[PDB]
Structure formats: structure tokens, C-alpha cells
Amino acid sequence: IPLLLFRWKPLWGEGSLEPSPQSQAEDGRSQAAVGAVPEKDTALHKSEEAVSVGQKRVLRYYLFQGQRYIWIETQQAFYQVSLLDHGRSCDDVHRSRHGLSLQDQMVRKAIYGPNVISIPVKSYPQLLVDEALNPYYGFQAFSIALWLADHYYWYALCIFLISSISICLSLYKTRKQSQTLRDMVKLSMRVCVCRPGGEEEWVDSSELVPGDCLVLPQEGGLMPCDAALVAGECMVNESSLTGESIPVLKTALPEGCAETHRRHTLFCGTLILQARAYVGPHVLAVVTRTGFCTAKGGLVSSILHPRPINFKFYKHSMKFVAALSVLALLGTIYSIFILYRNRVPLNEIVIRALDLVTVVVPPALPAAMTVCTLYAQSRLRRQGIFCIHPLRINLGGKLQLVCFDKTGTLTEDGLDVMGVVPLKGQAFLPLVPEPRRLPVGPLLRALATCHALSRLQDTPVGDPMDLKMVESTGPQLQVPVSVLHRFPFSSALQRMSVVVAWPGATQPEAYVKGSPELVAGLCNPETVPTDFAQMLQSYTAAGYRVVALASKPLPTRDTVEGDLSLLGLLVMRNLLKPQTTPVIQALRRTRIRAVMVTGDNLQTAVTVARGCGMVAPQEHLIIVHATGQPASLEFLPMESSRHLALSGPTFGIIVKHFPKLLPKVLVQGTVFARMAPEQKTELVCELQKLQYCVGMCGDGANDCGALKAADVGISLSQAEASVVSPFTSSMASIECVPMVIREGRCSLDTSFSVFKYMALYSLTQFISVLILYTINTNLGDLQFLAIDLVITTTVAVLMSRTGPALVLGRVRPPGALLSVPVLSSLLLQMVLVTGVQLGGYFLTLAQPWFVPLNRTVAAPDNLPNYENTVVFSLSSFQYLILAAAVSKGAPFRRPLYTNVPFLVALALLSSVLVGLVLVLLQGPLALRNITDTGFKLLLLGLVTLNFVGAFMLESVLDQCLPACSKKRFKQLERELAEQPWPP
Ligand SMILES: Nc1ncnc2c1ncn2[C@@H]1O[C@H](COP(=O)(O)OP(=O)(O)O)[C@@H](O)[C@H]1O
Ligand SMILES: [Mg+2]
Ligand SMILES: [Mg+2]
């Protein structure tokens, strides 16, 4: 020890590297280290090695963002604990069916931990110190001490009381955010395990390690651990990790690993429904990942350690500070040079000149910007839209592009069958609209057994496609029996296989059900006829939902899928929602681009993108359809502002073999079809590299990678807020997509209003003291208190309560404070402010009842003079004129009379402040009460010259047209104008 710099820290974290290198020795040999600093580039993080309790061997671990890193003496490095058993063979978990004994469970627990999502409950002394130990409140405690020196008790009290409001609002924001995360990871539950010889023992869910076995109750419940199913079957509701409320099917793990075997894994938190065994006495699961290593542990660990959003946090910090410093120092050296000309004794010139740098730092600035964000999150919640991080609400007003998923999002999630189109030897015999009429053969057993719905509590429950084609024929559900669901439906492979058998068969048959251009590629080519592309387009370009069916007899693996015989097409109808078409046309009107992103068929997705309005009539679009070979694009025009339509594999050829042709497609492509759930994610990440600000409105599991990758992701038709998306709407409509844009624009406008107000606020009171430091007549105590506490804090907390508009328009919020329409406002609003203070001061000098002030006493001591009363009365109205001037909401917010507490406060404070002029309270506030003539009515006729002169000045400045591209996409669009890309 003896290297601590605590003796030099009591006489003063700007540079973390220049401070930790002196408080601790720069020592190598991390086997014998105690603290580790964790970054090459980026920001620094100092981590403490933990409190190792390993008796047999020393254990050196440390938490870092929940992720334990472990020390290994045979490699001499810090490897991640999640990495440990990575690469484990598929037969090892089947040798792990008996679990772990108590001699090996305790060893495991130390390495992995208690399997708990660690949301720490911060105490109020631990949380007041986390907020008050900041430079800003360090300057506000310097301000409480500096005024107290001059005996301004009242002024000092409100610097404490405003900062106590500012602290307690940041302790409401933080404590309620962490209570939201803590209420969705609470999984205390009794769990039965198996030991090496016949034990259950009823262990707790916070006592589980990887490698341990786990039996599952028939009734089901939340999944405590990220297990792996080895023996049995179960139906899982994965709405807490994906978004689909439909149950999925979980096949047991074969013999031969968490993302590949996605249909074999029971993720943590997702509820299980039936959990049948069918092989032994009970159903077995083997634990793979625990608390911060699992998914729902890695989603929470990305919530509370987020990524920087791609928007400037108010654009300029340093530039604004520099401007303030030049502006506020030129008013500071003025009071140096003027108070010396008024012959101050130079002891009080250092306490007066340090009071001008105090008034330009308003104490209510973090409180006014906190409620600007709490009001925004509270307005979305009443409209049904939820939120986790309210720092992305301001990204809603910057959306230049929104991507949508077609089925269940633009269209209705429910289906209705139209009838099968059978096949009898390359024929396409015509459609059977009631499929309980065609005879018992391979096709009638196909659509009655190739499903995954389950008999659960008096109603069948499953996929909305599978619920309809079984209802289309109407058999009972528990004569053909299902041997094994050989392949559950995955969205990336676009098919589903079921092996069936029935009494009276020589051999079982193997049915399939998938997308028509993928099954017909798979089937024996001597069965699919020559007009399959024409018989498909006759249905799928009328707006129908078509899947195919095929069979093969079996005399397991995926030998089932291949050398099939095509049975028939199943045709379903998918109608748009009633709310889809006005929303897409509202986005197209306001120059926000809308993009179809779906996994469904191409000709179906084009006839949906016309019926709702991605492509208006008399607008040409081109289907590209690159070949699977590395040849060209071939362009097939569609006849029914260029648009483009792509297939899934077409987007794969262009991103891998035409890399310079890819930006010309993304600036004008509107329909993307047959997209894999990892190709949707790739499209969002490729659009953001063109410097778009993309949105994403989706539904279900295939959109999960795209919702995370987007700047704004919205998930539909869910309760409270899921971990999956930043914004989780619960409306089952896309009309929550303009609500986020419209709330996002007003919050980006009511934040720049509070910025302009506190700038116009500080400056007004700064000049109102500069007029009173000359003539040695500084402002009162209670007057200062009223100006800072009663007037200004009321019209800044209530200022941002207004609400967003009702109709979007094609104008964006400016996104930059220091610009020429804003500095021309702040210059010309303040030329006026000084004109009606100096002009109201030089006019009271020329009155016959006027006596000057006794200059040779002091500044605060014995002066209730006339020079204070004619300035305080004419300055206290400036804070209500400017509170309603910058609160303009005609393009973005609303007119301010809708905000009822911002009318009642702004009229009661404009009525008391008349009673301090005409009718007084002059004991307090030290007002010169001897004014008895009709000079009162001349000052009120000068306030009205400001109540009109400020509203009628910004209306001129809004009509400012200066007569005197950076974004990549804009450049491409210009190039496209000159030369069209498709021809
Ligand atoms: N339950 C199912 N069984 C078999 N095939 C399906 C099922 N659901 C969808 N498909 C087919 O798989 C393809 C891709 O699936 P998916 O991406 O989930 O489609 P969607 O965008 O309509 O949700 C679709 O063209 C659809 O025809
Ligand atoms: Mg689907
Ligand atoms: Mg969907």
C-alpha cells in the first residue's frame, strides 16, 4: 500500500488514465493483480477482482457488465465464462442426463454464479450520491455559499430548493426505470433436479448450474434456465423472447448448439404449456446457460448497457459554451470596470463580479429537461405505445424511412381458406373450394395431419395457418396418427414435414408443407408440370396466400425432404387491416419512405404494396430477379418515380457480387420479398450505411434481428413492454408508427423551446443586473427569489405538458441549436428586452416626483429605491412574455392554450404581477411603495409593447429565406435523377 492519493484528493475524474496510474502502481503480471482497467480505444473502465472463496485453488474472477471473466492458470488469460463449454458435443448432454452430484454442484456454482439476473436495489444514500456528485451541482453548491456570504438568505434558499427538485426528478427517472427491469426478471421458483442416484430434493431456481439436469412439470410454467431438451416434447410460448404468442414445438435433441438447435432449446423465461413425456416416467432437460449468459439475460444486459444512438446529443456543447463564455465575460469585465468607476473598495468587486457568472447558470435547467422527457413517455403510454429508453423518443422525429412486414402487420393475421388445387399426373385438375369433399387419398391426409397444433384445454391451439386447413376438412384431433413431427416450421427454411401412419398401410408416408417455389424445386421433376409458374401466378398475383403440399412413402434425419411427389396448392386469402391504407398514404404524403419487407411470395407482396399504397397507380416498378448464377440482373418490368421489387436470393446475389450496384437499389427499392430472418437484419444495416434513419414495424420472431438493428423498432400487439424492442406497441395496427413520429417531433421541438427559454431567461436577468450594478443599486432578495423560484420554475415545468399535433407534415425539426434562425431570434428578442428596460428607466428619470438613489450607502443595505421598482416590475413581465413567445407549436406541437396548467399559471402570474404595479406587497420584495400617480398605467403600456412586439417579431423571423447533400442517399438520388439506373 502507501500509494493512495487521498491526501491530494481532499484539496480539490477528468482524465481517468492520469488518476488511476498514480493511485495504483502500474504493475504487470495479472496473475498477481488486484484491479484491471478495461480499454486500444474507447472509454476506460476500472474493474475490481472479486472476493474468491475457492479453498482448493485460488479463483480469480470479476464481474464486468454482468459477464464473468475467469482466470485460467494453464493459459494465463481472462476467458469469458460463457465461452467455457462452447464446442460441446451433442452426445455429451446425453451422458449428462443423470445431472451433477453435490460434490460437483458446489464447484460449478462458484465458476458460474447463482443464476440470477442481478438488478441491484440501490439505496437512497447510494443514489443521492450518484446524482449530486456532479460538477453542475458542485457549481450550485458554490452558489449557495457565495450568496450566503452577502446575506441573501432568501436567494440562497431557492438555489437549494430548485436543486432539490432537480435531484428528486433524476431519482424518479432512475428508480422507476430499474423497477421496470426488476419486475420482468423475477423468477423465484421451486425446481426439481436429479442427482447421481435417485433424488429430487426440490432445489431453488437460483441454485442451478450448467450441466445439471432438470425435470419439467406437466402443468408447465416459466423456464428458470436456458435448458436443452433431451427426452420429451413440450409446447412453449416464446412471447417474452420473440414476440409470437403462438406456441412453438420443441423436439428432443438427437445424438451426434444453441442457435443451430433452436428447436431443441428451452430458453429462459418463456412459458411451457403441456410438456408431454411419451418415452419414460418424466421429461428431462439439461441446463446449458445461466443468468447473464442466456438470452433474456443478454437482452437485459443490452438494455442497461446500451449503444450510442446515431444522433448528436443536441449537436453542439463546446460551441455553445464558448459563445456563452465570450458573451458572459464581456458582461463580467464590464462590472469590473464600472464598479471601480463607482469606487467600490475592491473587496466587494470580487463578490459582485462572481455573482454575474452565477445568474447565467440557471438552477432549473436539469429539472426542465427531465420533465420534457417524462411528459413524452407519459403521452405515449396513454396512447398504448410503451418504451424502455426514452432517449430514443427524439429519434422518432428523425425517421426518414420505415420498413414493414406484410403478414399480420399490414394485413390481418387471421386467414381463410379458398380451396385446394389438386394434381393428377401433371394436370392441375380444377379447384375444390370445400376440401371436406375430395376423397380419402394422399392429399386429404396431408392437410389434416401436416400441422403442429395441440389439444389444449377444450380448444385447439396453434399456428393460424394450421388452425384453418384442419378446420377446412374438419377431422377430430385425439384415424391416421402422427408418428413424429420430423421438422417443425422454421422461418428460414420455409417448410414443415410430418411422418404419418394409419392401420391398413404397407408403409408410412412422409408429408410436407412449404412455400410453392421451394417445394416444387425439391420434388421429383417428373411430377411438377410445365405450367407451375403460370398456375401459381394466377392465384398469387390476385393477392392470395399460397402454400404447397407433397408426399413420399417411407419403406430420423431430413431424408424426408427430397424426391417428393407434388400433391396440390392450398390457396388462402389475406386481407389488409382497415387502418393500413390511411397510414401508408399519410407517410407517403410527408416524404417519409415506406418499404415492404416480408418473407412471403413476390407477386403476393407486390399486390399488397398496391392495395395499401407503397406503389400508387401510374407509378412504374421493376422486378429485378438476379439469377442464382453470377450473371446479370435481367430486369423484368411490371405492367399493371421508379420503384424496385426484389426477391430474397436476388438481394443475396447483389450484396455478394454487385457491390457498387447495391446503393442504387436501396434508394429506390420498395418491395423486398422472400427475405430470410437474417436477411431482414442485413437490409436494415445496409440502409443505415446510406445514412438513413430507419424505422421498423414488425411482428413475430422473424423480425427480431431487424427490430434490434433499427434506430426505431416497434413491436405490435403485446402487454407491458417486452425486452425485444425499444418501443413495444400494443395496438395490432401500424397506426402506432405515425404516433411515434408525431410524438418524436414535438419532443424534439419542446426541447429546443426549453433551450431557447433558459437562454433567453438567463440573459434577461443578466442584463437586468448590469443595469443595476451601474448606479450601485443591485436587485433585491425576495425579488430574486420570486424571479427564480415562483415565476420561472412554474413556467418551465408546466411548459412541456402540451402535446403533439394531429397531422404530420413534410417539415422536420431542425436538429441544431446554433443556427441562423435561432441566433437571429435570440439577438432580436434581446435587443427588444434591453429597449424596454433602458427605455423604461430613462423615462422615470425625467419625472418631476423622482428623487435619485442614495449611492453612498451600499448595494443591498438601505435601498428600496425607484430605480429598482421600475426595473423589477418591467423585468418580471419579460419572463412571462418569453415563456409564451418561444412556446409556439403550429408546425409541430399545438397552440399553447390547450395546455391548461400553462394558461392558469401564465394568467395568475400575469395578474399578481399587475397587483404589484397598480394595486402592494412592498414590505417584502423591498419595492418603492411611494408611487401614486398615473405613471403606473404608462409602464403597463410599455409591457404591452413587448407582449405585442415579441409575438410580432418571431412571426417575421419565421419568414426567413436565406439566399446562399451531406447524406449519402441524397447524393445517389440526385445521380438517379440525371441518369435512371434501371435502363
Ligand atoms: N405454418 C407453416 N407451415 C408451412 N409453411 C409456412 C407456414 N407459415 C408460413 N409458411 C410459408 O413459409 C414462407 C416464409 O414464412 P414466413 O417468413 O413466416 O412468412 P410470413 O412473412 O407470411 O410470416 C411463406 O411463404 C409461407 O408460405
Ligand atoms: Mg408467418
Ligand atoms: Mg408476422
Residue numbers in the entry: 60 to 71, 113 to 139, 143 to 146, 148 to 360, 365 to 582, 610 to 613, 620 to 696, 708 to 779, ...
Quote the study that presented this structure, word for word.
ATP13A2 belongs to the orphan P5B adenosine triphosphatases (ATPase) family and has been established as a lysosomal polyamine exporter to maintain the normal function of lysosomes and mitochondria. Here, using single-particle cryo-EM, we present the structures of full-length human ATP13A2 in three distinct conformations including an E1 state (apo), an E1P-ADP state with ATP and Mg2+, and an E2-Pi state with SPM, phosphatidic acid (PA), and phosphatidylinositol(3,5)bisphosphate [PI(3,5)P2]. The structure of the human ATP13A2 adopts the typical P-type ATPase fold with overall dimensions of 125 Å × 75 Å × 70 Å, including ten transmembrane (TM) helices and three conserved cytoplasmic domains [N (nucleotide-binding) domain; A (actuator) domain; and P (phosphorylation) domain]. In addition, the P5B type ATP13A2 also comprises two specific domains: a C-terminal extension domain (CTD) laying close to the P-domain and an N-terminal domain (NTD) preceding the A domain showing amphipathic feature.
